[PDB]
Amino acid sequence: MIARWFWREWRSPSLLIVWLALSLAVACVLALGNISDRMEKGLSQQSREFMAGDRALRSSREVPQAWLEEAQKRGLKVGKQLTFATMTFAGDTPQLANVKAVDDIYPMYGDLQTNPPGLKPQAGSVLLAPRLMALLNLKTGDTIDVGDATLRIAGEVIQEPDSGFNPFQMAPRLMMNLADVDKTGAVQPGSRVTWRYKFGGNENQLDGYEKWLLPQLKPEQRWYGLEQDEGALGRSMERSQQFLLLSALLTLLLAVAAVAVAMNHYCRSRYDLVAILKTLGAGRAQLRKLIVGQWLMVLTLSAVTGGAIGLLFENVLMVLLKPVLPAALPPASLWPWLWALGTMTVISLLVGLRPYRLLLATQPLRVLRNDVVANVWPLKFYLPIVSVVVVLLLAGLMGGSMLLWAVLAGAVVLALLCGVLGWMLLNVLRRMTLKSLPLRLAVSRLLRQPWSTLSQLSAFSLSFMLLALLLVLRGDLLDRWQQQLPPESPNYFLINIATEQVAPLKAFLAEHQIVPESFYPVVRARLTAINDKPTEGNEDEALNRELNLTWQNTRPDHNPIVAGNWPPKADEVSMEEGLAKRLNVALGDTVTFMGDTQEFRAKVTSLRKVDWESLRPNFYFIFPEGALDGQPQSWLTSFRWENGNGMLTQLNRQFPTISLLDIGAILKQVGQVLEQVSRALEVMVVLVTACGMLLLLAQVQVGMRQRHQELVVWRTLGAGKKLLRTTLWCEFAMLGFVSGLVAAIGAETALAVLQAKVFDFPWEPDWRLWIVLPCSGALLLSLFGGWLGARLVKGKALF
C-alpha cells in the first residue's frame, strides 16, 4: 500500500525536483567536503612525514656539523635537505629549475613516488619532474646537464614525501644528492640556497635537542615543528580550503532556495490532499507518522543518490586535477559523509518545519472552501528565527572568519544588484516599442511577476558570474599576455650575480643589441627588528623570507615617492608604501637587518608607492648607495628580448652561475595551471548551473497553474499554437539573454576595476565574451523553453 503510494507520489514534478535538488546538494557538499578532508588528511600525514620527525631547522647557511653530531649522539635521525635554483640542459636548450639535495637517509618516513618507483638520488643520478621532461623533450635513462655536471636521468618525480603543494610554482623539481651537489661545482657561496635539517626520534630527546640548540639559532635560522612550518604554503592551502568552502556554500544556498520554493509549492498542492485525509478520519498521530515517514524516505533516497553522484564527481575531480594535485592522496574518511548527511538533514528540517506544521495543522474546511488556509506561524515571526539560526549556523561553520563573511555578503549583494539591474533592463526594454507581439507579451509577463523573475534572474546571474569569471581568467589572461607589452616593463630578470661578473654580462648586453635596463645591487637579508622591536612572530609574508635590498643613485623610474626625501643618506632607507601601511612603519622609524655577514641598521626616511602588482622590479627597502658593501653584494637586473633563444643559450654558457628568469615561461606555466583550475571550476559551474536549472524548474512549477490558464486564455482568444510556442521560445531565450548581458556587465566591471586600481592596464572591451556568453545562455534557456512548450502546448489537453 504505502509502497505504491510513495512510488506514485514520487513521480510528482515538485516532489521529484525536491528529491533531485537535495541529491545535488548532498552530492556537492559531500564531494567538496571530501576533497577538503583529503587535502587536510594529506597535509596532516605529510606534516608527519614531510618532517619525518618533530623538529626542523631552516637556514640560509650551512649550520655547524657539531649540532648535527649532537643530534646524532642524542639518538636522533638527521635528514638533510638543500633547496636551490639553477639551470638544466635540454641538449642545447637551457631552462630554469629548482634542485633539491637530499642524503640517502631521506626518506626515513613516508614513501617516495618516482617513475620508476623505488629510486633514490645516487652519484651521477638525477630525478626530474615530468613537466620538465615534457618541456625538455628528455626521457628516463638519458643524461642531462645541470650546472657544471652531466648526470643520468634515473627517473621521473611522481610525488615526493618532501615535495610541497605549490600550484603556482616557478621551477620543476630536481631530486639529487649532496655528493653530486659538491661534484657539480655550480653551487656558489651566498647563493639562493636553503638548508633544511629534520630531526626524528622519540619526543623527549627531540625536545632536549631543541632546547639545547635554541640559544644557538641565528635570525636566518628558524626552528619549527609539525604545524610551525606555515609560511606561504599554509596560507595557500588555507586559501584553497576557503575557496572550496565558498563554492560549496554558494551551491548549497542555491539548492536551499530551490528546495524551499519547490517544496512550498508541493505542500500548497497537497493542502487539499491532506485536508481530504483529515476529513476521512486521519488522526494527527497517523497523519504525522505518514508525512514524517514520506519525508524520511525521500531524504534517505536523495542522500543515497546524491552520495553516488558525489562519488562520481569526486572521481572526476581527482582525474581532472592531476597537474595541481599530488598524484597519491590519502583515502577519504567517513567524516565527509557525516558532514553531508547532517547538512542536508538540517537544511531540510529548517526549510520544512513550517510546511510540515502547515500540513499537520491544515484546516479540513479547505475541503469545502478552496481559499481558507490555516494561518499558523506568520512570516513576521518565522523569518527572524530562521534568519538567526542560519547566521548562527554559518558562524559555527566559520567562527571568526571575517574575510569569508565579507566575501559571501559581497557575493549575495552582487547577486541582488545583478537582479535589480536586470529588472531595470527589462523595464527599459518594455518602455521602448516592441513590433513583435511575443516579445512584448513576454517582457510584460516578466515584469508583472516581480519576485519570481527577480529571484530567477539573480540565480542565473550568479551562475553566469561563475562561468563568465572562468572565461575571463582563461581568455582575458591570454589577451592580457597580448596586453602585457606596456611601456618600459622589464621582461627577463637576472638574479644572483657576483660583482666581478657585472662587466662581461653588461658587455654581453652591449653586444647583443640589448639596452641595459635598471641595474639593482641587491643584498638578501631578513628583517629582525622594527624600531628595535623584534619582528619574529608576525605572520607577514615579507618577514618570513629573504628581503631584497638595493641602492640607486637616482630615483626609481617605476616607483613614485610620496613621503620623505630622495635620495636617502647613510643609515637612511626608503620604505615601500604598502608594507609601511601594513607594518605600521612611519618616517624616522628604525629597521634592523640580518645580512649574510653583518647585522646592519637603517632609518626609514622616505615613503614610495611601489606597485608590487605591476610587473616591475619591486623592493620594500632601498638603501643609500654604498651602504651594504660589507654584505656580499649580489646583483639583479632585467632586459627585454623577443627574437630567438640562442642568445639566452650563449649567455648561460658564458655564465652558468647567474640566475635567469623568463617572465614568458613562468607566465605560460601559470597560464596552463590556470587552465587546469579552470577545468575544475567549469565542473563546479556545471554543478551550480544545474542547481540554477533546478531553481528554474521549481519556479516555473509553482507557476504551472497560472501559466497553463494563461495559455488557455490565449488559445481561446485566437492565439496560434505556433505563436504560443514561439512566445515561450522567445520568453526563455530573452530571459537567458538578459542574464547573459548582466553577467557580461559584471565581468566587464571586474576587468575595469582590476585594470584600473589593481593592475593599471588600459581597459578594452572584450567583445568575445559579450558575443559568446549571453548567446550561450539564450540557447540553453531556449532549449528549455522548447521542451516546456512541447510539454504544455503540443498536448491537446489545453481544452
Binding site: 500500500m1 505504491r4 503510494w5 481530504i276 483529515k278 476521512l280 478520519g281 494527527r284 469545502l368
Partner: protein, 224 residues
Amino acid sequence: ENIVEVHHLKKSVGQGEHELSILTGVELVVKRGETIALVGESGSGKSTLLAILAGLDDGSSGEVSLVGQPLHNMDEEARAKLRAKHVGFVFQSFMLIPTLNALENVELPALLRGESSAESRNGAKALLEQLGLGKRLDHLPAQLSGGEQQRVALARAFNGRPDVLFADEPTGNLDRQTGDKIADLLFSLNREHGTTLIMVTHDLQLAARCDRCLRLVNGQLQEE
C-alpha cells in the same frame, strides 16, 4: 435514538460591521434511517451548515449532538476519530486521492481505522464489483470518467458503512443520466444500510427523493 440533534446553532462570519451572521439559530433532530435533504440558494451558508453538522468547524453558539456527543466540546482529534468511526463523505468534486487506484481509494478508510487488509480488500472489491468497475481496480483517478470517479468516492464512503453520510451536490459535474444513476444507486445502497444522509444541493427532484426536505432561509431551517 436521534442520530443528529441541532439546537439553536448561531453562526457568524466576520467582525464588526462585516460580521455576516449567516446562521441565526438552527433546531433540527434527525432520526436514524431518515433521508434529509438540505436545499437553498448557492452561497447562502448551506456549505457552512453542512460543515458545522459534521463537526468540521465550530459555530458562534449552539448545541450539536452527532451520535450523542457534544461536538462543541471535543477537540479536533476526537472529531476526526468520530468522523472515521461513523461518518462518510461525498463531494461535488468528489475529492478522490489523485495518486491512488480505485481499490486503494476505497480501502483507505479501513487502513486509517487500522482494520485488517484482507477482509477490507474483500469488501472493497465486492462493493466495486457491485458498482461494475471490474476493469478499473488499478486505474488511476485521472483516467476515470466523472461518473466512475463518483462511483469510486461513493464506494469509499460505503466501505465502513457509516451511520451518517454528508454529501453535497453529488451530481454537480455530471449530466442527467449519470446523475440519476449515481443518485438512485446511492439511495439503493443506502436503504439496506440504514444510514442517515444529508444532501446539500439545489436540485428540486433530488430533494423530493429524500423523505424530508429542509430549505435554508436567512439563517433558519424551514420544512418544505
